[PDB]
Symmetry: C3
Subunit: 370 residues, 3 copies
Amino acid sequence: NNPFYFPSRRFSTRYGNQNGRIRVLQRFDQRSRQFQNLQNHRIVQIEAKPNTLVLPKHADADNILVIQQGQATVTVANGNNRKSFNLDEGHALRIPSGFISYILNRHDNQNLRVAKISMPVNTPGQFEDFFPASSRDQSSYLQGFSRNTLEAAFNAEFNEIRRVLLEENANEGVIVKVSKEHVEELTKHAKSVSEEGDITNPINLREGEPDLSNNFGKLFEVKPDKKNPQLQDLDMMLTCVEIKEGALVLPHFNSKAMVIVVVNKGTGNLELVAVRKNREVRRYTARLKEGDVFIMPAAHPVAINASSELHLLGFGINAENNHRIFLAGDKDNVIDQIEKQAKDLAFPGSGEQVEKLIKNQKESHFVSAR
Amino acid sequence: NNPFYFPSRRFSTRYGNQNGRIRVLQRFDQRSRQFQNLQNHRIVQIEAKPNTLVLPKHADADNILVIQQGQATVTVANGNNRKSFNLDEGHALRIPSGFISYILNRHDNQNLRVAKISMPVNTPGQFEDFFPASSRDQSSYLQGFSRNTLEAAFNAEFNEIRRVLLEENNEGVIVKVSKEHVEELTKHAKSVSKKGGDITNPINLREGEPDLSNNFGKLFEVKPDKKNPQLQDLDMMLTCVEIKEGALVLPHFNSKAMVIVVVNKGTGNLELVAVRKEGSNREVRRYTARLKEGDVFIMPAAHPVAINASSELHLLGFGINAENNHRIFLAGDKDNVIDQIEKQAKDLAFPGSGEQVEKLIKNQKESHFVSAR
Amino acid sequence: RNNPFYFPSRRFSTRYGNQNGRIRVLQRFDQRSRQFQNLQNHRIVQIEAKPNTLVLPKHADADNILVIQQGQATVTVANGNNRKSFNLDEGHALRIPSGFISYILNRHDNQNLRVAKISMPVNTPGQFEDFFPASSRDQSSYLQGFSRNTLEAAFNAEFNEIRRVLLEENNNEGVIVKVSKEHVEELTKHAKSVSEEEGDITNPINLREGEPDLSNNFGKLFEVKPDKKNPQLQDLDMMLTCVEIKEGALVLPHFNSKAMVIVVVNKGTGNLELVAVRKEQREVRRYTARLKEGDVFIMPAAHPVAINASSELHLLGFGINAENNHRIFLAGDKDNVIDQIEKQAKDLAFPGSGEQVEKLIKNQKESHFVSAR
């Protein structure tokens, strides 16, 4: 009924067992053709129990992962290097396609929640995970090669190769339980957020001062610019918005960015306004819950009311030179920038009346829903 | 019958009243699949009566507008800034998606004609205009929000909000403006003559010296390069060609740019040559059209084109995939690629000898544009 | 069609062909399978020409990189104001921008010429046409597409002279013609061998220039990457790769991290193993093919691949999405990513202990290429 809204139910789990699960949202362009531009963006949500490890793999997709909740140790490896990072909530990490990575929940009793945006390299909207080891969920890709090839490659008997690499490990699946001793082994090397062979360092989305901030909300944003060259390559921005309970983000829009937003935490109500076929204004609404996804098309006015402390994670594509533009309040209010005489000709009220009404809201960006 | 030709009839009007109209060309890829690469480019033509104003709005499309005829005052506003520009014929202005703009015909008695290329951001080939105010043509998008949201947002009673912002002001989206209002809207208008929050200055397409020029024609071109960084972002070039009455642009093509051209003024005849399969044996196909003001046509890359002017012909060209494009000619002295073929190669390829081919080629002493006699 | 990544020479269809040679074009990749949609705008052309033979002047509405697979050529590139002729040997590559005229001389007395081309259409995804200025039994001159009046005004001559020297069929063989020894020497007299660039006529690239990236007794891999040294490869975001695998040797399981590669077999025979993870009809799928000269296959990014040479195997690779690509190995010493997994992670992932995994991995002391025995 609301094509911009993707409830957690629209996620299907790809890997899942007692230790956690890897869920993947449906392709956006399958929902509606108005998301064709988002066709090559898939949202992944990973949940892992304490002292749990997502086994090594690579995908034929480029990735940015962000910690929604908890604490992780994420490792990235290419042909000649490995780096392990301790990631906290609101930290992001780029994982280039074809690099191996694995994810440790390094917490004793808190669950790990991770959000990923995957951008397939080969087939628009489609990617696969490639595990070097076998498990009950999937075989090692090494099994795809012949006996002769494997033996020549590893310089060893097929029976040894099969015994140590190819068999199913002693079977949980791709997310396994890890002993305290093993956990400490895996975190000894990790470094915390605060380059080499395209293994780039983690980004702290909440680094420094928020772009927008008052008593009712904060918006943090990491833009595609000199400070983050890799975001330039992707033409993406990463945004973290926190809306206090009982507060509202004023009607606003991104001028050119299209944003996929996931609800990291909290509840609230989405209003999204659109013009469609002489021309009618359509209102779309949704009750936001943790794990939900929604799409903010560029230049479509949006307002969001927080039922409880609301944490939203935004992946913005087509982000270069984006402006986040407001329709009420003092700062960033584009309606205010219309010339007085133009306001007078456009609106029912006089220019004076329009300009007065506009000055009623003394605050900017976020205000109380009261 | 000619898929490259789009007569003014193929425009449908989206907004229209006594004061003018906003017309939009059909999606190019709906005509034919050979225009799939142009799918995200829509042509808009705006006509406005004197002392008339196209009301504030933004689109979910990136825009370049060009004055085809008359004089305008165009205002662009974002979240923290506003700039107003006096634009004359042949002046272009970039309006980023989501920025508000409005268009004043500041002339007392001459109509304003404006051409726009719109490139949708969300849905390939589709965009919508978003008006903050209501009118008989459309509701304010502010009406899409709830009473509670509006009241909290504006810090005011819904009744006041509805009274001053939400009600219908009626005329439509293009309204009549009093002389006094007109003078108010033009009072701080800039006349930028050269480049100077992503509110970029107007471009003069006829700035400086034309690329090509003789007694029969001129071609002006603004290329995607350091001088116009925004054209680099778009990988686009803007071209203005003026062909004298009774003159002909020589057979030629763009090496890699695809060009959407609109006929700003005049009449003429288009010849476009494509190679098409009837695998096996393929044939040369000739496409023609009688060009009239307001017509659009597509110049696919590397397809030879010639244009004969029935009367002073002004053509506006929006070139995509423009970087490192070469406009290459098939006759005449300068830019003639056939001339660059080695003499021995000419001899082997053509029916005549190398000497005969080279002599025939030297007959045309002129370049680019010649008399249709 | 059992292995969608493999394209045997039979899947090429000849577009132009006669006694002197033939121009063959591979089917569109996305018509085979939708997993090749990203390769939709890349067509593979294979040209074969007899000794002292010339492929007649033409341009395409496609961008092109050509590479000499075998023999020796003189290739000429012409735009509106310039011409350059290049002597190209095996493993030399040349960029031919769309809309530029080019022709290809087999300058050898008795060896055949084989040329591979990657064409990227400008107008219509996956589709392009060749535009010949001259007529032949295979195609008419595009100049015939223009009217008598236009031609006469353009060339400043009688239509009868124009038709006689330019438009008639040059008894006609086709687009590949025989050339006399004297004509051949005429065409090679100004050819350069592998100077400052000029009007986007860029110089030839030697794929085997300098030192190979990977090299040992069993194989070599040469690569030209999109970087400052080859600005035009940057524009294309492409890499060009030349791999030579000794008879009886194997390229270790490996993959490109992000590049998608179209590879053509220039010479030799071998066996392809390509591993894909896929959804059950999650399972590992093995694809194989017997490689022969003229075959094409697709290496999707991040899909493990191993290749066994039945005889000296020369592979030419066109890599798209190439920037920051890493060629990553799954066995051997250097570039082995499995080796980079932490010991404790190896232990948790694999059936063996970390120590056992790390020992087994050190068995193969060599890198990249090893003996198939």
